Tab-separated table of C-alpha atoms and ligand atoms in Angstrom:
chain	number	residue	atom	x	y	z
A	11	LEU	CA	-26.644	97.096	-66.518
A	12	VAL	CA	-27.578	96.666	-62.866
A	13	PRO	CA	-25.081	96.710	-59.345
A	14	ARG	CA	-23.879	93.996	-57.505
A	15	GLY	CA	-25.368	94.176	-54.222
A	16	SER	CA	-28.842	95.504	-55.983
A	17	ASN	CA	-30.539	92.772	-55.207
A	18	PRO	CA	-32.298	92.865	-51.346
A	19	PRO	CA	-31.288	89.695	-48.481
A	20	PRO	CA	-33.605	87.351	-49.237
A	21	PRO	CA	-35.857	86.763	-46.798
A	22	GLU	CA	-35.486	84.596	-44.115
A	23	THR	CA	-36.259	81.051	-44.293
A	24	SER	CA	-35.258	80.326	-40.742
A	25	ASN	CA	-35.801	82.150	-37.597
A	26	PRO	CA	-35.509	80.013	-33.929
A	27	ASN	CA	-37.731	81.689	-32.181
A	28	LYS	CA	-40.861	81.861	-34.484
A	29	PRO	CA	-43.399	79.788	-32.861
A	30	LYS	CA	-44.145	77.693	-35.965
A	31	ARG	CA	-46.058	73.631	-36.621
A	32	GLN	CA	-46.359	70.997	-38.636
A	33	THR	CA	-49.581	70.246	-39.618
A	34	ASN	CA	-51.192	68.354	-41.483
A	35	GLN	CA	-52.062	71.070	-44.413
A	36	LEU	CA	-48.990	72.172	-44.413
A	37	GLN	CA	-47.772	69.164	-45.362
A	38	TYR	CA	-50.117	69.313	-47.435
A	39	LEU	CA	-48.654	71.963	-49.135
A	40	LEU	CA	-45.284	71.125	-49.341
A	41	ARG	CA	-46.024	67.103	-50.344
A	42	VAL	CA	-48.850	68.015	-53.042
A	43	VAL	CA	-48.861	71.993	-54.150
A	44	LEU	CA	-45.172	73.123	-53.960
A	45	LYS	CA	-44.625	69.563	-55.664
A	46	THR	CA	-47.094	69.647	-58.192
A	47	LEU	CA	-46.284	73.481	-58.464
A	48	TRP	CA	-42.325	73.189	-58.382
A	49	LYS	CA	-42.325	70.466	-61.868
A	50	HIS	CA	-44.418	72.666	-63.652
A	51	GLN	CA	-42.903	73.242	-67.150
A	52	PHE	CA	-43.446	77.266	-66.325
A	53	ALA	CA	-42.161	76.967	-62.802
A	54	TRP	CA	-38.554	77.935	-63.275
A	55	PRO	CA	-38.641	82.201	-63.218
A	56	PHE	CA	-40.228	81.501	-59.469
A	57	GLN	CA	-37.933	79.248	-58.667
A	58	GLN	CA	-35.929	81.470	-56.779
A	59	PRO	CA	-35.825	84.997	-55.975
A	60	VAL	CA	-35.899	87.383	-58.900
A	61	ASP	CA	-32.554	88.633	-59.357
A	62	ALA	CA	-32.789	91.757	-60.765
A	63	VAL	CA	-28.671	91.626	-61.360
A	64	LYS	CA	-28.757	89.492	-63.221
A	65	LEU	CA	-32.046	90.572	-65.195
A	66	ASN	CA	-30.742	93.673	-65.107
A	67	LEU	CA	-33.713	95.087	-63.541
A	68	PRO	CA	-32.813	98.115	-61.761
A	69	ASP	CA	-36.828	98.820	-61.427
A	70	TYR	CA	-37.775	95.696	-59.624
A	71	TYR	CA	-36.493	96.475	-56.010
A	72	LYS	CA	-37.297	99.837	-56.465
A	73	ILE	CA	-41.903	98.843	-56.856
A	74	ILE	CA	-41.651	95.439	-55.955
A	75	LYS	CA	-41.667	95.165	-51.737
A	76	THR	CA	-42.564	92.267	-50.463
A	77	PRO	CA	-40.895	89.931	-52.564
A	78	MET	CA	-41.742	86.510	-52.357
A	79	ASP	CA	-40.700	83.214	-54.503
A	80	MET	CA	-41.340	79.201	-54.910
A	81	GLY	CA	-37.387	78.621	-53.477
A	82	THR	CA	-38.403	81.074	-50.554
A	83	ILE	CA	-42.008	78.649	-49.978
A	84	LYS	CA	-39.867	76.224	-50.076
A	85	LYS	CA	-37.576	76.419	-47.726
A	86	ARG	CA	-40.256	77.824	-45.483
A	87	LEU	CA	-41.673	74.697	-45.468
A	88	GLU	CA	-38.873	72.885	-45.271
A	89	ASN	CA	-37.712	74.129	-42.291
A	90	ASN	CA	-41.292	73.764	-40.605
A	91	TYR	CA	-40.907	77.801	-40.792
A	92	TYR	CA	-45.008	78.753	-40.715
A	93	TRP	CA	-47.403	78.296	-37.339
A	94	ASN	CA	-50.519	77.451	-39.952
A	95	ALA	CA	-51.559	77.269	-43.570
A	96	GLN	CA	-52.223	80.053	-44.222
A	97	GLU	CA	-48.978	82.054	-43.533
A	98	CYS	CA	-47.788	80.043	-46.375
A	99	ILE	CA	-50.829	80.860	-49.052
A	100	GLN	CA	-50.151	84.547	-47.914
A	101	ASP	CA	-46.782	84.061	-49.218
A	102	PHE	CA	-47.586	82.701	-52.309
A	103	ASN	CA	-50.397	84.957	-52.777
A	104	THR	CA	-47.145	87.718	-52.844
A	105	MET	CA	-45.592	86.000	-55.075
A	106	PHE	CA	-48.067	85.611	-57.348
A	107	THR	CA	-49.396	89.979	-56.768
A	108	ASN	CA	-46.026	91.124	-57.215
A	109	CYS	CA	-44.944	89.557	-61.012
A	110	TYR	CA	-48.657	90.831	-62.247
A	111	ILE	CA	-47.755	94.443	-60.508
A	112	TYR	CA	-44.375	94.341	-61.666
A	113	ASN	CA	-44.997	92.622	-65.026
A	114	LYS	CA	-47.391	93.654	-68.192
A	115	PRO	CA	-50.597	91.835	-69.038
A	116	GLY	CA	-49.278	90.256	-72.364
A	117	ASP	CA	-45.768	89.607	-70.990
A	118	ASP	CA	-45.205	86.092	-71.109
A	119	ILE	CA	-43.827	86.229	-66.978
A	120	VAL	CA	-47.564	86.709	-67.054
A	121	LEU	CA	-49.043	84.093	-68.864
A	122	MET	CA	-46.828	81.747	-66.660
A	123	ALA	CA	-47.659	82.670	-63.121
A	124	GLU	CA	-52.378	82.725	-64.840
A	125	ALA	CA	-50.490	79.337	-65.288
A	126	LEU	CA	-49.386	77.842	-61.852
A	127	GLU	CA	-51.892	80.580	-59.944
A	128	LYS	CA	-54.657	77.905	-61.029
A	129	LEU	CA	-52.994	75.343	-60.803
A	130	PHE	CA	-52.769	76.344	-57.255
A	131	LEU	CA	-56.055	77.230	-56.626
A	132	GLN	CA	-57.573	74.008	-57.956
A	133	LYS	CA	-54.678	72.082	-55.171
A	134	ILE	CA	-56.006	74.942	-52.699
A	135	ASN	CA	-59.841	73.441	-53.163
A	136	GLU	CA	-58.289	69.544	-51.964
A	137	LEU	CA	-55.560	70.955	-48.597
A	138	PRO	CA	-57.487	69.339	-46.264
A	139	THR	CA	-60.064	70.986	-43.596
B	16	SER	CA	-89.905	74.922	-58.536
B	17	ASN	CA	-86.988	77.427	-59.336
B	18	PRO	CA	-87.541	80.495	-62.481
B	19	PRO	CA	-85.717	79.658	-65.629
B	20	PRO	CA	-82.510	80.884	-65.297
B	21	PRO	CA	-80.871	84.440	-66.617
B	22	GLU	CA	-80.983	84.337	-70.441
B	23	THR	CA	-77.513	83.656	-72.176
B	24	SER	CA	-78.908	84.803	-75.486
B	25	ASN	CA	-80.652	87.390	-77.182
B	26	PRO	CA	-80.660	88.175	-80.530
B	27	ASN	CA	-81.757	90.854	-80.813
B	28	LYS	CA	-79.500	93.023	-78.246
B	29	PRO	CA	-76.043	94.624	-79.078
B	30	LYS	CA	-72.687	92.806	-79.204
B	31	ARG	CA	-69.504	92.961	-79.227
B	32	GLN	CA	-65.367	91.058	-79.127
B	33	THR	CA	-63.503	93.757	-77.186
B	34	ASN	CA	-59.950	93.377	-75.385
B	35	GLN	CA	-61.276	94.009	-71.745
B	36	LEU	CA	-64.415	91.460	-72.355
B	37	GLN	CA	-61.513	88.744	-73.558
B	38	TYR	CA	-59.851	89.719	-70.596
B	39	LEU	CA	-63.267	88.661	-68.197
B	40	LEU	CA	-62.695	85.103	-70.271
B	41	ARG	CA	-59.552	84.116	-69.248
B	42	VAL	CA	-58.467	85.766	-66.850
B	43	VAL	CA	-61.191	87.088	-64.536
B	44	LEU	CA	-63.711	84.483	-64.233
B	45	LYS	CA	-61.716	81.219	-65.191
B	46	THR	CA	-59.343	82.322	-62.261
B	47	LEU	CA	-62.584	82.520	-60.444
B	48	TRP	CA	-64.007	79.672	-61.106
B	49	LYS	CA	-60.898	77.549	-59.760
B	50	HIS	CA	-61.034	78.509	-56.515
B	51	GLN	CA	-62.148	76.964	-53.328
B	52	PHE	CA	-65.168	78.980	-52.591
B	53	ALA	CA	-66.865	79.187	-56.459
B	54	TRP	CA	-68.942	76.141	-56.386
B	55	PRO	CA	-71.830	77.755	-54.997
B	56	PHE	CA	-71.642	80.456	-57.595
B	57	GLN	CA	-70.870	78.105	-60.762
B	58	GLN	CA	-75.190	78.056	-60.663
B	59	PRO	CA	-78.073	79.606	-60.286
B	60	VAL	CA	-78.755	79.490	-56.609
B	61	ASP	CA	-81.130	76.255	-56.603
B	62	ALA	CA	-84.096	77.284	-54.205
B	63	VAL	CA	-86.193	74.607	-54.285
B	64	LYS	CA	-83.132	72.046	-53.662
B	65	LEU	CA	-82.278	74.563	-50.877
B	66	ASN	CA	-85.534	74.850	-49.564
B	67	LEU	CA	-84.980	78.820	-49.565
B	68	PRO	CA	-89.273	79.708	-50.546
B	69	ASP	CA	-88.305	82.423	-49.781
B	70	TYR	CA	-85.281	83.458	-52.548
B	71	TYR	CA	-86.329	84.674	-55.180
B	72	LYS	CA	-89.375	85.909	-53.473
B	73	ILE	CA	-86.421	88.507	-52.538
B	74	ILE	CA	-83.997	88.444	-55.391
B	75	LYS	CA	-85.960	89.508	-58.526
B	76	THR	CA	-82.095	89.970	-60.810
B	77	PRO	CA	-80.627	86.481	-59.629
B	78	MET	CA	-76.982	86.509	-61.057
B	79	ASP	CA	-74.279	83.553	-61.261
B	80	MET	CA	-70.468	82.486	-63.070
B	81	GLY	CA	-71.790	79.403	-64.819
B	82	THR	CA	-74.641	81.740	-66.771
B	83	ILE	CA	-71.525	84.797	-67.182
B	84	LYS	CA	-69.372	81.418	-67.943
B	85	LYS	CA	-72.525	81.041	-70.467
B	86	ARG	CA	-72.608	85.008	-71.581
B	87	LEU	CA	-68.865	85.337	-72.191
B	88	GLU	CA	-68.677	82.773	-74.423
B	89	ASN	CA	-71.882	83.682	-76.607
B	90	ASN	CA	-70.320	87.199	-77.020
B	91	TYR	CA	-73.455	88.210	-75.315
B	92	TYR	CA	-71.901	91.970	-73.745
B	93	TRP	CA	-71.798	95.324	-75.219
B	94	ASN	CA	-68.835	96.211	-72.940
B	95	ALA	CA	-66.972	94.994	-70.211
B	96	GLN	CA	-69.096	96.644	-67.233
B	97	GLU	CA	-72.335	94.725	-68.541
B	98	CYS	CA	-70.290	91.755	-67.371
B	99	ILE	CA	-68.524	93.820	-64.301
B	100	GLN	CA	-72.214	94.851	-63.501
B	101	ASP	CA	-73.501	90.801	-64.001
B	102	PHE	CA	-70.419	90.129	-60.683
B	103	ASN	CA	-71.480	92.965	-58.986
B	104	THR	CA	-75.170	91.351	-58.944
B	105	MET	CA	-74.372	87.985	-57.652
B	106	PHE	CA	-71.908	89.764	-55.352
B	107	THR	CA	-74.734	91.682	-53.943
B	108	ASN	CA	-77.194	89.301	-54.420
B	109	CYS	CA	-75.130	86.631	-51.836
B	110	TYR	CA	-75.091	89.668	-49.274
B	111	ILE	CA	-78.263	91.131	-50.014
B	112	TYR	CA	-80.190	87.492	-48.515
B	113	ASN	CA	-77.222	86.097	-46.444
B	114	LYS	CA	-76.797	87.566	-42.633
B	115	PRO	CA	-73.046	88.853	-42.487
B	116	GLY	CA	-71.563	85.653	-40.074
B	117	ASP	CA	-73.244	83.637	-42.716
B	118	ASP	CA	-70.079	80.515	-44.486
B	119	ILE	CA	-71.527	81.572	-47.486
B	120	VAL	CA	-70.913	85.439	-47.484
B	121	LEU	CA	-67.400	84.406	-46.888
B	122	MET	CA	-67.013	82.648	-49.686
B	123	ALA	CA	-68.246	85.531	-51.649
B	124	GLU	CA	-65.678	88.260	-49.825
B	125	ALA	CA	-63.293	85.694	-50.487
B	126	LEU	CA	-63.817	85.202	-54.619
B	127	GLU	CA	-65.232	89.466	-54.537
B	128	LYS	CA	-61.523	90.007	-53.518
B	129	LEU	CA	-59.548	87.764	-55.766
B	130	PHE	CA	-62.082	88.931	-58.735
B	131	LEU	CA	-61.550	93.026	-57.755
B	132	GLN	CA	-57.501	91.789	-57.829
B	133	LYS	CA	-58.468	90.783	-61.248
B	134	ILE	CA	-60.835	93.167	-62.361
B	135	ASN	CA	-57.793	95.977	-61.043
B	136	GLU	CA	-55.705	94.952	-64.318
B	137	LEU	CA	-58.263	95.549	-66.942
B	138	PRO	CA	-56.335	96.740	-70.065
C	201	H8C	C1	-41.552	85.501	-62.034
C	201	H8C	C2	-40.698	87.051	-62.177
C	201	H8C	N1	-41.647	87.805	-61.584
C	201	H8C	O1	-40.661	89.203	-61.698
C	201	H8C	C3	-40.244	89.339	-62.700
C	201	H8C	C4	-39.731	90.803	-63.455
C	201	H8C	C5	-40.118	87.937	-62.985
C	201	H8C	C6	-39.045	87.333	-63.902
C	201	H8C	C7	-39.049	87.569	-65.284
C	201	H8C	C8	-38.412	87.134	-66.658
C	201	H8C	C9	-37.331	86.332	-65.743
C	201	H8C	C10	-36.931	85.990	-64.820
C	201	H8C	C11	-36.857	84.889	-64.339
C	201	H8C	C12	-35.643	84.823	-63.546
C	201	H8C	C13	-36.575	85.227	-62.860
C	201	H8C	C14	-38.188	85.657	-62.717
C	201	H8C	C15	-38.427	86.369	-63.770
C	201	H8C	C16	-35.564	84.836	-66.198
C	201	H8C	O2	-34.832	84.144	-65.993
C	201	H8C	N2	-36.962	85.652	-67.003
C	201	H8C	C17	-36.633	85.803	-68.428
C	201	H8C	C18	-36.098	86.923	-68.926
C	201	H8C	C19	-37.967	85.544	-69.201
C	201	H8C	C20	-38.531	86.147	-69.702
C	201	H8C	C21	-39.785	85.318	-70.274
C	201	H8C	C22	-40.592	84.312	-69.554
C	201	H8C	C23	-40.020	83.384	-68.709
C	201	H8C	C24	-38.726	84.011	-68.298
C	202	H8C	C1	-74.512	81.776	-53.413
C	202	H8C	C2	-75.706	82.041	-52.649
C	202	H8C	N1	-76.169	82.275	-52.413
C	202	H8C	O1	-77.770	83.480	-52.310
C	202	H8C	C3	-77.714	81.921	-51.671
C	202	H8C	C4	-78.226	81.386	-49.973
C	202	H8C	C5	-76.360	80.917	-51.616
C	202	H8C	C6	-76.337	79.751	-51.542
C	202	H8C	C7	-76.617	79.948	-50.010
C	202	H8C	C8	-76.177	78.555	-49.599
C	202	H8C	C9	-75.198	77.368	-50.651
C	202	H8C	C10	-75.462	76.930	-51.660
C	202	H8C	C11	-75.455	76.200	-52.480
C	202	H8C	C12	-75.420	75.734	-53.846
C	202	H8C	C13	-75.813	77.207	-54.536
C	202	H8C	C14	-76.426	77.987	-53.576
C	202	H8C	C15	-75.910	78.797	-52.339
C	202	H8C	C16	-75.190	75.465	-51.280
C	202	H8C	O2	-74.944	74.248	-51.492
C	202	H8C	N2	-75.141	75.511	-50.152
C	202	H8C	C17	-74.648	75.332	-49.239
C	202	H8C	C18	-76.616	75.271	-47.912
C	202	H8C	C19	-73.666	76.020	-48.404
C	202	H8C	C20	-73.622	76.326	-46.607
C	202	H8C	C21	-72.664	76.687	-46.357
C	202	H8C	C22	-71.701	77.161	-47.015
C	202	H8C	C23	-71.691	76.834	-48.198
C	202	H8C	C24	-72.605	76.098	-48.774
């Protein structure tokens, strides 16, 4: 039973002094890539930061030091928080590798992440040049 | 003309299914295949179409993910290491033939990073 306050603050989704832009690529990231992944049947555990209290995982944030989730990525894209598509792609990469680090190849959550990862790579193929 | 591609079947070769070989098809190859830079590596190097009269004068152990795919689907390998060697061959062939600045090399480097990330999790 994991106590209250065991979760770190979520990753920031706004920063007035960070330089940022809207680009054709970042707009495609929101309007095609994030949307396609969000609506997927396996998206839901990834739609918000991992809640180690609710999930009773006293080890999660002892192992994962660079948390990321699609809810954070969504808010970032909506807030035009990124300078370029690569910064956003790096957040997806973080989300996936975190899952693969914390969990075990047989786990349901891993099957879900592999599904979304393949979909992700497919949608990145048509990322505007 | 191009040489015949590498073999994907061989009745005399010792063969097994292992869980590691199944991981190589289901996770490693099937993730890599979807990557935006996978396409040049999905079939043998076509030296006629590419006008590379030196390619098969230099590369004598060609390999590609198309060959690897077929080999995994055909249960061609005895252990995961033979398949891993095929990937390593494909990558080093690219690095051998090309110059470090080349777009194909950056593509290769991206794919090899993903490949290593998946190999990291071999059971
Ligand atoms: C994603 C993710 N990355 O690391 C972990 C742990 C999760 C995770 C695993 C299992 C979860 C969740 C849930 C919400 C958010 C993150 C996670 C959640 O409800 N579960 C349950 C226990 C679950 C089990 C099996 C498949 C899907 C969800
Ligand atoms: C892979 C690979 N390994 O050695 C060579 C040469 C290649 C190769 C280089 C450039 C290619 C291809 C193509 C298909 C299959 C193999 C290769 C191909 O269409 N190109 C074009 C010319 C190309 C130029 C720059 C980046 C990617 C592809």
